[PDB]
Amino acid sequence: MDPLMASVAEAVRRRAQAPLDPDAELSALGVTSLGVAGLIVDLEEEFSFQFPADAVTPEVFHTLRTLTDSVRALCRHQSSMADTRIPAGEATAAWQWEVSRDTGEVHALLCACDAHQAAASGTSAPARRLETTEHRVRSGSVHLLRHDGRPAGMFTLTWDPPFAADEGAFPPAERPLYLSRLAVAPEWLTGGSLVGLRCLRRAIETAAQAGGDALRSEANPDLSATRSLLDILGFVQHGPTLSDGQGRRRVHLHKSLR
């Protein structure tokens, strides 16, 4: 095979669940959302480049051909193929990021995602304060991804810790930022939409552009899919797993930046 495409094909078969055609769809190979996350981390390690959040789309990860072409383009740019790096068409442009200004919209999205993931994991949905949503939205901390006008995913990014955590729960850092309320609309939680992966990468990029040297988070490890996602993208757990008298748990995660 062609060398770059051969490397990409090996990376893909690592994250597949089936026994290679350049025009084969990754989804048909059984590559899931977590699969794509591991694929991105492998390729970034192998070829010493960084995947942009807006390249985390089912269009880039459609087939082995599209993925290989995107890898080639991204590698070239981070050192001509601008036609590939800038994808033409209305489907790409249907996805738009904003700093949210609509409290009710944010709170409805958060609660829908919470309830869905609680049903899927067998855990209690967290209690969300509308006053917290109001404070976050007025602060400019909520970043929301729309598709065709309808909210799809979001994250909250603050200088203040949005959760209690002792000293030493995290490695030291000069300007840490905090991630909370990462949420995806139920319709995109099919396990292959990549919306959550895209929002998480966007939070990493935004925190890095803000001058942060660390991104801190509190995660429920019993939401095992998101826990794995955080782990694949390099969030390291510092200190032991906290747990209540009724078995509900939380862990503190730290990811280095810039």
Least separation in angstroms between CB 125 and Cl ion:
20
Q: In whole angstroms, what is the distance from residue 128 CA to residue 149 CA? A: 24
Based on its alpha-carbon atoms, the radius of gyration of the chain, rounded to whole angstroms, reads 19
Least separation in angstroms between CB 80 and Cl ion:
35
Q: Which of residues 151-170 bind Cl ion (CB under 5 A)?
A: none
Question: What number of other Cβ atoms are within 10 A of residue 232's Cβ?
Answer: 19
By DSSP bridging, strand 249-256 and strand 236-237 are antiparallel
152 vs 169 by CB, closer to Cl ion: 152
32 vs 217 by CB, closer to Cl ion: 32
Q: Which of residues 29-88 bind Cl ion (CB under 5 A)?
A: 32-34
Residue among 86, 55, 96 nearest 194 (CA): 55
103 vs 121 by CB, closer to Cl ion: 121
- Locus of tokens 């033409």: 88
Tell me the C-alpha to C-alpha distance, in Å, between residue 160 and each of 100, 139, 151, 252.
18, 11, 25, 15
| Candidate residues 168, 171, 191, 211; the one interacting with Cl ion per rule CB under 5 A | 191
In sequence order, the β-bridge partners of residue 157 are: 179
Determine, following the binding rule CB under 5 A, whether residue 141 of this chain makes contact with Cl ion: no
Number of residues engaging Cl ion in binding (CB under 5 A): 4
Least separation in angstroms between CB 117 and Cl ion:
12
38 vs 151 by CB, closer to Cl ion: 38
* Burial class, 39, CB count within 10 angstroms (exposed 0-12 / middle 13-18 / buried 19+): buried
213 vs 222 by CB, closer to Cl ion: 222
Contact residues toward Cl ion (CB under 5 A) are: 32-34, 191
